[PDB]
Design a protein around this ligand. Structure first.
Ligand SMILES: O=C(CCC(=O)NCCc1ccc(Cl)c(Cl)c1)NCCCCn1cnc2c(Br)c(Br)c(Br)c(Br)c21
Ligand SMILES: NCCc1ccc(Cl)c(Cl)c1
Length: 332
């Protein structure tokens, strides 16, 4: 007997009710702009999948960001484009402005709205309790939206959160790993950065859903309030689950494994050991106590659960007491 199937608790059938063109990205036809509308100004960074530039649209003098893609399978470019187009205009989702073909490498380039990013070295030095609650709530808006639109981001981490702090403006970026959720579909578990991988990825449980993003969000929250980056600091994918188990305990892990009849890689036998579930107080000290509260710890505990089905949804997270003062402030 194999693993027990699983279904998302919410937004389970949203893609089923769509025309197939919404989610059948392999059949998407790309609408191309004119690369001659743009001039590159300077390089902002480079990754395994792209090089990123600041640019100017010389037809309207607008600043934009240009992501020149490295060679990748055409269906993965179509996937990112289709998801960006489907989510465009949603709260705190980066806006795809144009798609052009780089004359040099003949590769596609995505053109995004510019965000005046805040120097985060200063941001983290003066970060307040209220700042963290406010921006977490802004991220939850983007996640509830994309989940409600049938999409898992699958790469939630601080690097993919742009913040213009002067204007309290936040954007969730890099949708190149995002996928459409379909009930019963088995997904690739080699997604997300190591430190933010959910337990379902680490034990190779492929029938996962939106709740994967909620684990990653809990990892980000823990690093913020405890000022410990990364929070779960594994040496490799195997050790990453050991680091989680030393905090969440091994009992709930084996309860999770048994519930879904997951066949655990035999490497884990001699490294997981036996660990109690720790109390969050052991990460609190004089340098982070101003960011930690009973509300923050209650919220954090309800995100970081082995069982993906028992994690808060994005909308449930937004209703947590941790956000009460943010919610009433936004009512104005
Ligand atoms: O520096 C970062 C962000 C690092 C960071 O700590 N965040 C804030 C994290 C955070 C999250 C939650 C909370 Cl609660 C709080 Cl408090 C803080 N990531 C590098 C991006 C590399 C350059 N890069 C790539 N793609 C880009 C796009 Br697309 C645009 Br548009 C723009 Br602009 C740029 Br620059 C782009
Ligand atoms: N049109 C020449 C400048 C240029 C080169 C490459 C790209 Cl991808 C862009 Cl948008 C603009």
């Amino acid at each position: 007997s194999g693993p027990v199937p699983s279904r998302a608790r919410v937004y389970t059938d949203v893609n089923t009710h769509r025309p197939r063109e919404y989610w059948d990205y392999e059949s998407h036809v790309v609408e191309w702009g004119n690369q001659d509308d743009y001039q590159l100004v300077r390089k902002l960074g480079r990754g395994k999948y792209s090089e990123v530039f600041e640019a100017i649209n010389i037809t309207n003098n607008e600043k934009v960001v240009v992501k020149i893609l490295k060679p990748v399978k055409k269906k993965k470019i179509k996937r990112e484009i289709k998801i960006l187009e489907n989510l465009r205009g949603g709260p705190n989702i980066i806006t795809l402005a144009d798609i052009v073909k780089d004359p040099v490498s003949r590769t596609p380039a995505l053109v995004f709205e510019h965000v005046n990013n805040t120097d985060f070295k200063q941001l983290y030095q003066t970060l307040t309790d209220y700042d963290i609650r406010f921006y977490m709530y802004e991220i939850l808006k983007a996640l509830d939206y994309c989940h409600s639109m049938g999409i898992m981001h699958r790469d939630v981490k601080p690097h993919n959160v742009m913040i213009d702090h002067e204007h309290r403006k936040l954007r969730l970026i890099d949708w190149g790993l995002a996928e459409f959720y379909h009930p019963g579909q088995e997904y690739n578990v080699r997604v997300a950065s190591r430190y933010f991988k959910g337990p379902e990825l680490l034990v190779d449980y492929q029938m996962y859903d939106y709740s994967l993003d909620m684990w990653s969000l809990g990892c980000m929250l823990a690093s913020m309030i405890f000022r410990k980056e990364p929070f779960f600091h594994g040496h490799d994918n195997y050790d990453q689950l050991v680091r989680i188990a030393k905090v969440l305990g091994t009992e709930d892990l084996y309860d999770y494994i048994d519930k879904y009849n997951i066949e655990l890689d035999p490497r884990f036998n001699d490294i997981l050991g036996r660990h109690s579930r720790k109390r969050w107080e052991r990460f609190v000290h004089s340098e982070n106590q101003h960011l930690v509260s009973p509300e923050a710890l209650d919220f954090l505990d309800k995100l970081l659960r082995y069982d993906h089905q028992s994690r808060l949804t994005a909308r449930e997270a937004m209703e947590h007491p941790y956000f009460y003062t943010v919610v009433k402030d936004q009512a104005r």
